[PDB]
Design a protein around this ligand. Structure first.
Ligand SMILES: O=C(O)[C@H]1O[C@@H](O[C@H]2[C@H](O)[C@H](O)[C@@H](O)O[C@@H]2C(=O)O)[C@@H](O)[C@@H](O)[C@@H]1O
Length: 226
């Protein structure tokens, strides 16, 4: 008794260009499955037309992974001259107790390293400044460097918020409601890697492994250019 996101034409294209992973890396639904009305407690359309992702547990996810319409996985040159752009209108609800960080958008390499995570965090300390209840950008410093550069993007609101990720020419930019919040961050450390976008709910370091993270997307698209 869950309504499928495929019933809304605003999602047809991105679902054609995605596969759904849940609760870890295994695909539960490919593009054709998604287009054919795939729906579950962790992936469904709300009555006000949000695509909602929900998942409990440490490092568990309900997440769309960028695909080509051919069925090939997206694997674009992370630092190439072609622009790759992800856009999403996301409402981040107040998270359940014990949910401490939820990753909502990513640029991931074709191996084991997230180039970029955009996440909600309960608390973060960056160079001696603690922020509470914010949306954060985390860019990994390298494949062999587990550390990352972190940038607060936005004070958390439940209001629908426009996020835009633009990747081109070894630089990455993020806009939030039209305002640039990360301006041409360097990602040259992923020269020679291939990349793709992800979107959904990825539950990072919960303190209650039974609590549900929950993220809602009113619009989602990923594109190439030139
Ligand atoms: O030591 C850390 O906790 C390390 O985590 C990093 O984010 C990771 C996420 O929590 C997820 O596990 C997944 O997405 O992998 C990420 C990663 O290893 O890059 C960063 O937040 C990093 O700053 C932090 O030290």
């Amino acid at each position: 008794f869950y309504t499928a996101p495929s019933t809304e034409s605003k999602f047809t294209e991105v679902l054609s260009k995605a596969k759904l992973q849940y609760p870890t890396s295994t695909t539960v639904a490919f593009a054709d499955d998604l287009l054919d009305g795939y729906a579950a407690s962790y992936f469904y359309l709300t009555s006000d037309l949000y695509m909602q992702f929900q998942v409990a547990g440490s490092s568990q996810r309900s997440e769309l992974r960028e695909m080509e319409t051919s069925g090939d996985e997206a694997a674009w040159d992370c630092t190439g001259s072609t622009a790759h752009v992800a856009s999403a209108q996301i409402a981040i609800p107040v998270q359940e107790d014990g949910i401490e960080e939820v990753t909502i958008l990513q640029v991931h390499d074709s191996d084991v390293t997230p180039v970029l995570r955009i996440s909600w965090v309960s608390s973060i300390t960056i160079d001696g400044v603690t922020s509470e209840d914010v949306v954060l950008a985390t860019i990994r410093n390298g494949i062999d460097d587990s550390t990352a550069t972190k940038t607060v993007l936005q004070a958390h609101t439940t209001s629908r918020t426009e996020f835009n990720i633009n990747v081109q020419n070894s630089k990455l930019s993020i806009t939030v409601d039209g305002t640039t919040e990360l301006d041409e961050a360097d990602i040259s450390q992923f020269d020679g890697s291939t990349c793709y976008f992800k979107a959904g709910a990825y539950n990072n370091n919960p303190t209650d492994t039974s609590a549900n993270a929950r993220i809602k997307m009113y619009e989602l698209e990923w594109v190439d250019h030139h």
